[PDB]
Copies of this chain bind each other. A is one copy, B any other.
Amino acid sequence: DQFRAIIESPEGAGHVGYQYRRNTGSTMRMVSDVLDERVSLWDFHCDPSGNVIQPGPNVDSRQYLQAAIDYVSSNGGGTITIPAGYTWYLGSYGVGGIAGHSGIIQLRSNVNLNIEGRIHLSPFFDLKPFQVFVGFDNGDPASSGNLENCHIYGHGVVDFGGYEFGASSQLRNGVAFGRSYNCSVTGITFQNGDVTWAITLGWNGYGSNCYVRKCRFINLVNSSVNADHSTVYVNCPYSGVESCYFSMSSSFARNIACSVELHQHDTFYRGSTVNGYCRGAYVVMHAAEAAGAGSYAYNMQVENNIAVIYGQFVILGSDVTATVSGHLNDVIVSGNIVSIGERAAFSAPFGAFIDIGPDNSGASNVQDIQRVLVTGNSFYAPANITDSAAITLRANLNGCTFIANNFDCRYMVYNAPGTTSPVVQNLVWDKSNVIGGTHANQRAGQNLFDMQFASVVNSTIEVQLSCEDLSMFSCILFPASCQLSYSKITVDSAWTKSMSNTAVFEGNQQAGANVYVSYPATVNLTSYNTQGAVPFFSTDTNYAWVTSAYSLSINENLDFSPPATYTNKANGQLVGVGYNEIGGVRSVSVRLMLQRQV
C-alpha cells in the first residue's frame, strides 16, 4: 500500500488536507502546516534515529533543548514549550561562547521558552560552577553580540538540585541574559540550590528593558561555602524586578544573601516580598560597570516591598576606578514595610533600614551618593536587637532625605565609634519621622542619634520623640571629633522633661556661627534683691551661644515670678527680667528650651 506508506511516514501529515472550520474562504492547508505553528521540546528530544526519548534522571536533555533553540532561532524566532507533567534533566555543559561562563544552555534572540514543566540539574553539577541559561555568544562579554527579545515564562520550575558549592571562588547562575535587550523572566519558580545569582540582567550597562516579574526564588543558598548571593542582579538600565517572592530558610542566607541589586540608571525593585535574607537591595554604581550606560546610576526606585531580613534593607554605594568615578543619585525608597527578624544582637550583619556602605575593598572616602529620598516606610526591630538603626552611615554621604517614616529600632542615625569617620553633607531628618518605642528602656549608655562622623554640614536633624525613654544617654550626641557647620539640630521638648541630657555637643559645636539649634536643659537661676521688675541670671556661664531661651516649667510661687524668656550675656550667663512682688534674692531651677538662631 503506497498511500499507507506515505501517510505512516514522517511526511504523512503533509498529505492530509485541512481548512479551518470547513470555511471555504480559509486557506487550504496541510495538517503538518498547522502543527508547525507550535513547537515543543518533544520535537527535538529524540535519538539520532528520530525516535523520541523520554526525559528522566537518567537522560541528559541539554543537547535536545539546544537543538530546539538553534532551529527556532534560524527560522526567525518563536516560543518553545517545555512540557508540563515531566521533569527535564540537564547533565552536561554546553559548548562554544557559553563555555567561558560554565554555561549549560545558550539562549538566542527571538526564541522564547515557555517552561510549563520542571527543569532539574543532574548530579553531574554537584560541586561545580554553572550558568543554566546564557545569552552571551562569546567567551569574552566585550566581544559578544546582543541577546534580544528573549522571554522565559510559564508555571514551571528551574530546580538547581540542592547541590552545594564545591568552592567559594565558584560562580553559579540560573539565567545570565548577557547584553540583553527586551528580555524577561515571568512566572517561574527557581528553587533548591546554592547559587551566586538566580538571574542577571545585562552586562556592564549594556542591555535595556529587562524584567523579572511574578517569579518565586526559594532556598537558593544552603552552605557555608557560598561566598555571596544576590538573587536578581540588574546590570542594564530601564530594567527591574516587580511582584516577586524571595524566601530563604538556611542560616547561611541570613549572613550573605541579598534579594536584588540595582546597578544602572532607571531601574526598580517594587511590590515584592522577601523572607529569610540578610539584605533587601544593593543600589550601587560600580565604576567598573560603567561602560554600557555611563558612570551615573540615577532614577533608582525601591518601592512597596515587604521584607523580613537580618541585616540591611537598602545598601547604597558608589565607587571609583583609576579612570572612572561612579555616582549614585535620584533614588527613592518608599512604601516599604520591613522588619529585622528575631535574632540575637550582633548575630548577623548590623540591622539597618538604609546602610551607606564602604566599597568592596572597605574604602569609605570614594562615594558620591546624593538626592536620595526615603519616605513613607515602616521599619521594626525587636527590642533585644542592639544592632538596629534607621540608617547606618558608614561612608561618605553627599545627601539623603528622610521624611514621614516610622522607625522602631535601637538607633535612628548610627556609625560605630572608632571605625570610619564619614564626611556627611545634606543629611535631612525631618521632624515628621516618627520614632517608635520598642527599644525604650534598652538604651543605657547609648545615643539615639550617634553622630560618629568627621564632619556634618548642610544637615538637619529634627528629633521628635513620641514616648519617653529615660534610659538613653542622649537624644543626639556629637563627639568632639565631629565638626558641625551650617546645620540645624533640634530636640522637641515632648517626653524630655526628665531627661538628664537631650542634645550633647562634646566639642561645644552648637556655638558655630551657622549652627541653628534648640534643645531642653535645666538651668539654675538667681535674682537680685530688687522689689518689682528684677533680673534673674544663670549661675553657670555655659550659654554664650544661646540667642534666646524660654520656660518649660511652672512657677509655684506667689511672691515672685522668674522670667518667661531669656537672652544671654558676654560671660555666658542667661539673663531675663522677672518680677518680685516682695523683695528678696530668689533661687530657682528651671527647665528651659535653649535656642540658637531659631
Contact = CB atoms under 8 A, between A and B. Distances in A.
Interface string A565-580: 1111111000111110
B37 A37 contact: no
Contacts of A436: 371
A568 B550 contact: no
Nearest to A153: B155
B516 A495 contact: yes
Nearest to A75: B85
A24 B44 CA distance: 10
A16 B7 CA distance: 5
Nearest to A575: B561
Which residue, A3, A7, A50, A554, has most C-beta atoms of chain B within 10 A? A554
With most chain B CB atoms within 10 A of its CB, the pick from A9, A26, A495, A558 is A26
B533 A514 contact: no
Given A26-B44, A335-B332, A494 B460 contact: yes
A35 interface: yes
A582 interface: no
A86 B78 CA distance: 10
Given A28-B51, A238-B245, A551-B567, A404 B428 contact: no
A19 B29 CA distance: 16
Interface string A520-544: 0000000000101111000000001
Chain multiplicity (copies): 3
Given A432-B403, A466-B426, A467-B426, A20 B39 contact: yes
Interface residues of A, number: 168
Interface string A39-76: 11011111000111000000000000001000100011
Nearest to A64: B27
Contacts of A67: 25
A554 B544 contact: yes
A244 B546 CA distance: 55
Contacts of A10: 17-19, 28-29
B34 A37 contact: no
A225 interface: no
Contacts of A43: 20, 23, 26-27, 29
Interface string A220-238: 0000000000000000001
A486 to B, nearest CB: 6
A406 B371 contact: yes
Contacts of A330: 337, 339, 378, 380
A339 B371 CA distance: 11
A442 interface: no
Interface in A264-290: 266, 268, 270-271, 273, 275
Nearest to A150: B155
A526 to B, nearest CB: 14
A69 B584 CA distance: 98
Contact of A35 (B31, B243, B304, B403): B31
A359 interface: no
B299 A308 contact: yes
Most-contacted residue by chain B among A1, A31, A567 (CB, 10 A): A567
B242 A271 contact: yes
Contacts of A126: none
A468 B486 contact: yes
A306 interface: yes
A493 interface: yes
Contacts of A46: 26-28
A21 B75 contact: yes
A206 interface: no
A489 to B, nearest CB: 10
A408 B371 contact: yes
B434 A432 contact: no
A42 B33 contact: yes
Nearest to A514: B497
Contacts of A406: 371, 373, 401, 403
Contact of A375 (B404, B551, B570): B404
A567 B562 contact: yes
A597 interface: yes
A301 interface: yes
A132 B458 CA distance: 55
A479 interface: no
A337 to B, nearest CB: 5
Nearest to A403: B404
B432 A426 contact: no
B466 A428 contact: yes
Q: Which 3 A-B pairs have CB atoms at the shortest separation, nearest pair first?
A: A76-B85, A533-B533, A10-B19
Given A29-B52, A493-B516, 11 more contacts: A11-B19, A23-B43, A26-B44, A26-B46, A33-B42, A34-B42, A76-B85, A76-B86, A376-B404, A557-B570, A561-B567
